[PDB]
Amino acid sequence: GRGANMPFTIMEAESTSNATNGTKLTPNFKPGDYAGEASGRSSVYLDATGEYVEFTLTSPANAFVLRNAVAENTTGTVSIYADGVSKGKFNVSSKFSYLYATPSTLGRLGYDNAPGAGLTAYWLYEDAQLMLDQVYPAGTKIKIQKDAGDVSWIYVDLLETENVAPPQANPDPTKYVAVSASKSIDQALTEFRQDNTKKGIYIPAGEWTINSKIFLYGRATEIVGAGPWYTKLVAPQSQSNTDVGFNISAAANGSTIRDLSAWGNYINRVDGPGKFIDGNGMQNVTVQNIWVEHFVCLYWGVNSSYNTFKNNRIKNTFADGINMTNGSSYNVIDNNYARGTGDASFALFSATGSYNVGNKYTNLTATNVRRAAAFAVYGGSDNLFQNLYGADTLTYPGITISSYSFGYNTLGFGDQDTVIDGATLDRTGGDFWTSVGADDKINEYQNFGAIWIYGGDRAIKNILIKNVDINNPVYFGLMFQSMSPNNMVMQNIRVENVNINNPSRYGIKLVVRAEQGQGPAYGGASFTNVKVNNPGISAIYGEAQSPNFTVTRVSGNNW
Ligand SMILES: OC[C@H]1O[C@H](O[C@@H]2[C@@H](O)[C@@H](O)O[C@H](CO)[C@H]2O)[C@H](O)[C@@H](O)[C@@H]1O
Ligand SMILES: OC[C@H]1O[C@H](O[C@@H]2[C@@H](O)[C@@H](O)O[C@H](CO)[C@H]2O)[C@H](O)[C@@H](O)[C@@H]1O
Ligand SMILES: OC[C@H]1O[C@H](O[C@@H]2[C@@H](O)[C@H](O)O[C@H](CO)[C@H]2O)[C@H](O)[C@@H](O)[C@@H]1O
Ligand SMILES: [Ca+2]
Numbered sequence: 173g174r175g176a177n178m179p180f181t182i183m184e185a186e187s188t189s190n191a192t193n194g195t196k197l198t199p200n201f202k203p204g205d206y207a208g209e210a211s212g213r214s215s216v217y218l219d220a221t222g223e224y225v226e227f228t229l230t231s232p233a234n235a236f237v238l239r240n241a242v243a244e245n246t247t248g249t250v251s252i253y254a255d256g257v258s259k260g261k262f263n264v265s266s267k268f269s270y271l272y273a274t275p276s277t278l279g280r281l282g283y284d285n286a287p288g289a290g291l292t293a294y295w296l297y298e299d300a301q302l303m304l305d306q307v308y309p310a311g312t313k314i315k316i317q318k319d320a321g322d323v324s325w326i327y328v329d330l331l332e333t334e335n336v337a338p339p340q341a342n343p344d345p346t347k348y349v350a351v352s353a354s355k356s357i358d359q360a361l362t363e364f365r366q367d368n369t370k371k372g373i374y375i376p377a378g379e380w381t382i383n384s385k386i387f388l389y390g391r392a393t394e395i396v397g398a399g400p401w402y403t404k405l406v407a408p409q410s411q412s413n414t415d416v417g418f419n420i421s422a423a424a425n426g427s428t429i430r431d432l433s434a435w436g437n438y439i440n441r442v443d444g445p446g447k448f449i450d451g452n453g454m455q456n457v458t459v460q461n462i463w464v465e466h467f468v469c470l471y472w473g474v475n476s477s478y479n480t481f482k483n484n485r486i487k488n489t490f491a492d493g494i495n496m497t498n499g500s501s502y503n504v505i506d507n508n509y510a511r512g513t514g515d516a517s518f519a520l521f522s523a524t525g526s527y528n529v530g531n532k533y534t535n536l537t538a539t540n541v542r543r544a545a546a547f548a549v550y551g552g553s554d555n556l557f558q559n560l561y562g563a564d565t566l567t568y569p570g571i572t573i574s575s576y577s578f579g580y581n582t583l584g585f586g587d588q589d590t591v592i593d594g595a596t597l598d599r600t601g602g603d604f605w606t607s608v609g610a611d612d613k614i615n616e617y618q619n620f621g622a623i624w625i626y627g628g629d630r631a632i633k634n635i636l637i638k639n640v641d642i643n644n645p646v647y648f649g650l651m652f653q654s655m656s657p658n659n660m661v662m663q664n665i666r667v668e669n670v671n672i673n674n675p676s677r678y679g680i681k682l683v684v685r686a687e688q689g690q691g692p693a694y695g696g697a698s699f700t701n702v703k704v705n706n707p708g709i710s711a712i713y714g715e716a717q718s719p720n721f722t723v724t725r726v727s728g729n730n731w
Contacts, residue, residue: 173535173537173559173561174559174560174561174594174595174596175509175535175536175537175559175560175561175596176507176508176509176535176536176537176561177507177535178483178485178507178509178537179334179335179336180237180332180333180334181229181230181231181233181332181333181334182211182330182331182332183227183230183330183331183332183333184211184212184214184329184330185214185215185216185225185227185316185328185329185330185331186212186214186215186216189228190216190225190226190227190228191224191225191226192216192223192224192225192226193222193223193224194216194217194218194219194223194224194225194328195216195217195218195219196214196215196216196217197210197214197215197216197217197327198214199212199213199214200213201213201599201602201646203278203281203294203566203567203602203603204292204293204294204296205296206241206296206327208566209241209294209295209296209297209540209542209566210241210297210327210329210330210564211239211329211330211511211539211540211563211564212329212330212564212599213564213599215240215241215327215328215329216327216328217325217326217327217328218250218316218317218318218325218326218327218328219318219325220318221318221319221320221322222317222318222319223317223318224253224315224316224317224318225315225316225328226313226314226315227313227314227315227316227331227333228311228312228313228314229308229309229310229311229312229314229333230310230333231310231333231335232307232308232309232310232335233307233308233312233314233333233334233335234303234304234305234306234307234308234334234335234336235301235302235303235304235333235334235335235336235401236252236262236301236302236303236304236314236331236332236333236334237299237300237301237302237331237332237334238250238262238264238299238300238302238316238328238330238331238332239297239298239299239328239329239330239331239332239511239540240262240264240297240298240299240300240326240327240328240329241266241269241296241297241298241326241327241329242264242265242266242323242325242326242327243266243323243324243325244266244270244287244293245266246265246266246323247263247264247265247266247267248264248265248322248323248324249261249262249263249264249321249322249323250262250264250300250316250317250318250322250323250326250328251316251317251318251319251322252302252304252314252315252316252317253313253314253315253316253317254304254306254308254312254313254314254315255312255313256313256315258319259304260302260304261302261322262300262301262302262316263300263302264298264300264323264326265298265300266298267298267439268298268439268465268466268488269295269296269297269298270285270287270293270294270295270296271283271284271285271293271294271295271440272284272285272286272287272288272291272292272293272294273291273292273294274290274291274292275292275616276606276616278543278567278603278604281294281295281514281542281543281566281567282295282440282441282490282491282514282515282542282543283440283441284440285439285440294542294566295514295542296327297327297329297512297540298488299465299487299488299512301401303336303401307335314331314333316328316331334401336399336401337399339376339377339398339399339402339403340398340399340431341398342374342376342396343374343396344371345374346369347369347370347371347372348370348371348372348373348374348394348396349361349363349364349367349370349372349373349374350373350374350375350376351373351374351375351376351380352376357373357375357380357382357386357405358384358386360373361373361386361388361393364390364393365389365390365391371394372393372394372395372396372427372428373393373394373395373396374396374397375395375396375397375398375403375405375432376397376398376402376403377398377399377402377403378402378403378404379404379406380403380404380405380406381406381407381408382405382406382407382416382417382434383407383408383411383414383416384416385415385416385417385418385419385450386416386417386418386419387418387419387420387421388418388419388420388421388424388427389421389423389424390423390424391423391424392424392425392426392427392428392456393424393427393428394427394428394430395418395427395428395429395430395432396428396430396431396432397430397431397432397433397462398431398432399431399432399461400431400432400433400461400462400463400485401433401463403431403432403433404432404433404434404435405417405432405433405434405435406434406435407434407435407436407437407438407466408437409435409437411437412437412438412439413437413438413439413440413442413445413446414437415445415446416436416437417434417436417447417448417449417450417467418448418449418450418451419449419450419451420449420450420451420454420457422453422454425454425455425456425457426455426456426457427457427458428457428458428459428460429449429457429458429459429460429462430458430459430460430461430462431460431461431462432462432463433462433463433464433465434448434462434463434464434465434467435465435466436448436464436465436466436467437466438466438467438468438489438490439466440490441468441490441491441514441515442468442490443468443491445468446467446468446469446490446491447467447468447469447470447471447472448464448467448469448470448471449470449471451471451473451476451479452473452474452475452476453474453475453476454473454476454479455476455477455478455479456478456479457476457479457480458479458480458482459471459479459480459481459482459484460480460481460482460483460484461482461483461484462484462485463484463485463487464484464485464486464487464489465486465487465488465489466488466489466490467489467490468489468490468491468492468514469489469491469492469493469494469495470484470486470489470493470494471494471495472492472494472495472497473494473495473496473497473498473500473503474497474498474499474500475498475499475500475525476496476500476503477499477500477501477502477503478501478502478503479503479504480503480504480506481494481503481504481505481506481508482504482506482507482508483506483507483508484508484509485508485509485510486508486509486510486511486513486517487510487511487512488511488512489512489513489514490514491513491514491515492513492514492515492516492517492519492544493508493510493513493516493517493518493519493538494508494517494518494519495516495518495519495520495521496519496520496521496528496531497520497521497522497523497528498521498523498524498525498528499523499524499525499527499528500520500528500531501525501527501528501529501530501531502529502530502531503531503532504532504534505518505531505532505533505534505536506532506533506534506535506536507534507535507536508535508536508537509536509537510536510537510538510539510541510546511537511538511539511540512540512541512542513538513541513542514542514543515543515544516541516544516545516546516547516548516572517536517538517541517545517546517547517562518533518536518538518546518547518548519545519547519548519549519550520533520548520549520550520552520555521548521550521551521580522550522551522552522553522555522582522583522584522585522586523551523580523581523582524581524582524583526553526583526586527551527552527553527583527586528551528552528553528555529552529553529554529555529586529588530554530555531552531555531556532555532556532558533547533555533556533557533558533560534556534557534558534559535558535559536557536559536560536561537560537561537562538560538561538562538563539561539562539563539564540563540564541562541564541565541566541568542566543566543567543568544565544567544568544572545565545568545569545570545571545572545624546560546562546563546565546569546570546571546597546600547560547562547570547571547572547592548571548572548574549571549572549573549574549590550572550574550575550576550578550582551574551575551582551583551584551585551586551630552585552586552590553585553586553587553588553590553634554586554588554589554590555590555591556591556593557571557590557591557592557593557595558591558592558593558594559593559594559595560592560594560595560596560597561595561596561597561598562595562596562597562598562600563597563598563599563600564598564599564600565599565600565601565602565646566602567602567603567604567620568601568602568604568620568624569600569601569602569620569621569622569623569624569651570595570597570600570601570622570623570642570645571592571595571597571600571622571623571624572623572624572626573590573592573623573624573625573626573635573637574624574626574628575626575627575628575629575630575631575632575660576626576628576629576630576655577628577629577630582630583630583631584628584630584631584632584633584660585630585631585632585633585634585635586631586633586634587633587634588634589634589635589636589664590634590635590636591636591638592623592635592636592637592638592640593636593638593639594638594639594640595639595640595641596640596641596642596643597622597623597640597641597642597643597645598643598644599643599644599645599646600622600642600645600646601619601620601621601622601645601646601647601648602619602620602646603615603617603618603619603620604617604618604620605617605618605687606618606687607619607686607687608687608688609685609687609688609689610685610686610687610688611684611685611686611717612681612684612685612713612714614677618686618687619646619647619648619677620646620647620648620651621645621647621648621649621650621651621675621681622642622645622648622649622650622651622672622675623637623640623642623649623650623651624651624653625650625651625652625653625662625665625697626653626654626655627653627654627655627658627659627660627661627662627693627694627695628655628658628660629655629658629660630660631660632660632661632662632663632665632695633662633663633664633665634663634664635662635664635665635666636666636668637650637666637667637668637670638666638667638668638669638670639668639669639670640669640670640671641670641671641673642670642671642672642673642675643673643674644673644674644675645672645675645676646676647675647676647677647678647681648675648677648678648679648680648681649670649672649675649678649679649680649704650667650670650672650679650680650681651680651681651683652665652680652681652682652683652693652697652721653682653683653686653693654683654691654692654693654694654695654720654721655690656689656690656691659691659694659720660694660695661694661695662693662694662695662696662697662721663695665695665696665697665698666697666698666700667697667698667699667700667702668699668700668701668702669700669701669702670699670701670702670703671702671703671705672702672703672704672705672707673705673706674705674706674707674708675704675707675708676708677707677708677709677713678707678708678709678710678711678712678713679702679704679707679711679712679731680702680704680711680712680713680723680731681712681713681714682712682713682714682715682717682718682721682723683714684714684717684718692714692717692718692719692720692721693714693718693720693721694720694721695720695721695722696721696722696723696724697721697723697724698724698726699723699724699725699726699729700726700727700728700729701727701728701729702728702729702731703728703729703730704730704731705730711730711731712731
């Protein structure tokens with residue numbers, strides 16, 4: 173792509189191809205800011221009746237997603253036009269946006285939904301979904317316009333466009349028990365469990381309340397919808413933060429959930445509940461072509477292996493998108509799109525079963541990461557992250573590669589490579605933690621590059637980073653750091669075919685003193701065909717001050 177191959181096209185409002193009579197924001201990297209939090213670090217602000225931004229379709233579309241920001245505690249509309257003719261109204265709302273913290277309490281980002289004395293609003297953008305009753309061809313002018321009766325003001329960030337097929341019917345009424353106006357999901361599953369000729373259930377087009385955790389047991393179960401734009405599982409929207417969705421018991425290993433959407437009612441992060449799918453230790457489960465929003469996570473695996481997450485959309489969650497932990501191995505996380513996760517979009521945390529091994533995170537897109545990294549790998553062995561697109565992180569790297577234990581029982585990285593192969597990282601990095609007494613100090617935070625290679629308290633070894641383009645990172649392209657006093661010697665750390673374009677500070681930073689009591693990196697790394705282009709200060713910082721770290725310039729480096 174790079175990244176996921178999805179049927180929708182993403183178009184930035186602020187593109188120079190888009191006529192507007194509104195206000196185009198100058199980009200910055202600030203959390204809590206309408207530019208800093210936008211895709212592309214810019215939006216078009218519509219602030220008077222008649223103000224518009226005009227998109228042009230590059231593929232046919234009958235359906236649209238408008239990422240936008242409106243005032244706190246408001247709902248309303250903004251208008252959509254096709255070739256100058258009004259065609260409908262988006263339902264725009266800040267119900268799920270505006271999470272409050274302060275610049276020194278970003279650890280609270282996502283947790284606190286109420287405004288208050290001295291609190292700043294973060295996580296300002298949210299989405300509106302709209303289907304029109306015609307497929308408009310490529311080249312159609314799709315205008316977003318603020319008409320009389322629409323909201324008082326709106327920041328227009330991007331538009332998704334999609335040509336959605338008609339809804340798919342029950343594949344076989346004699347094998348899939350249909351949910352209906354008078355037969356609930358639980359009742360259909362009971363009928364399925366008690367009749368061995370059934371393969372599962374079918375959930376038709378419509379809105380279907382999920383006010384409970386729905387348990388899958390008995391045997392492997394198929395749950396099939398009509399398509400994610402059509403079958404909508406809806407948490408009770410007059411409630412907040414209810415733990416609903418599916419929980420897959422061991423008897424239902426081998427199950428499949430596909431072709432539907434799930435619309436949670438979380439308005440802030442809660443740690444414990446809130447994963448749309450629970451399945452601790454689950455095996456051979458397939459989750460395919462589902463679209464999930466407003467949960468804490470899609471899935472948090474614990475010794476969960478041989479599972480497949482494919483073709484999914486994970487948007488506007490309050491923590492991680494998918495995390496696989498504590499022995500989770502041989503999983504296929506392929507061709508998924510995440511935007512607006514509230515913690516790491518796609519993550520792998522290896523812990524004791526020795527390591528998480530054999531996982532393949534492929535063809536993944538993670539953008540507008542509202543906290544933490546787009547992609548996070550903590551230890552493990554023989555795990556592949558391939559064909560990635562990451563962009564617009566609020567507080568942390570595009571990719572974190574870390575051997576810090578967080579107090580859990582883990583061995584760090586193992587004896588087979590953890591591979592990042594093929595990645596584009598646009599405007600990644602950010603500020604987090606504190607930097608009291610730090611070297612190379614520019615603000616009150618620690619400062620994170622597009623890729624952070626962090627040796628923690630466990631072994632840091634066998635890391636291969638290749639075929640990566642890092643464009644306009646907030647601060648640095650590659651950032652290497654060793655936790656003191658552990659000073660774990662980094663071994664077999666190799667970087668190949670990497671372009672680092674326009675980093676504001678350095679192409680490569682070897683962290684010398686992250687904060688009081690911390691020192692420089694231990695071990696070394698090899699660089700082949702690594703280009704640093706137009707760094708703000710210099711190509712590499714820290715080399716002379718890191719006497720325990722050897723930079724090996726194999727060939728092809730311009731620094
Ligand atoms: O393995 C560590 C814990 O993971 C889970 O809880 C996570 C919590 O520690 C924090 O990281 O937030 C995320 C998102 O809300 C939580 O999923 C497990 O629920 C917990 O039992 C583990 O100890
Ligand atoms: O030491 C306890 C904390 O460790 C980790 O965070 C570290 C942070 O405290 C600061 O020192 O910076 C380093 C990175 O340079 C961080 O790794 C954990 O992330 C945090 O949860 C612990 O409280
Ligand atoms: O009050 C529930 C819900 O309403 C709005 O979303 C609509 C959604 O409920 C329905 O399923 O689809 C519509 C068209 O896509 C949505 O506009 C609000 O936008 C949402 O905040 C709210 O929870
Ligand atoms: Ca934008």
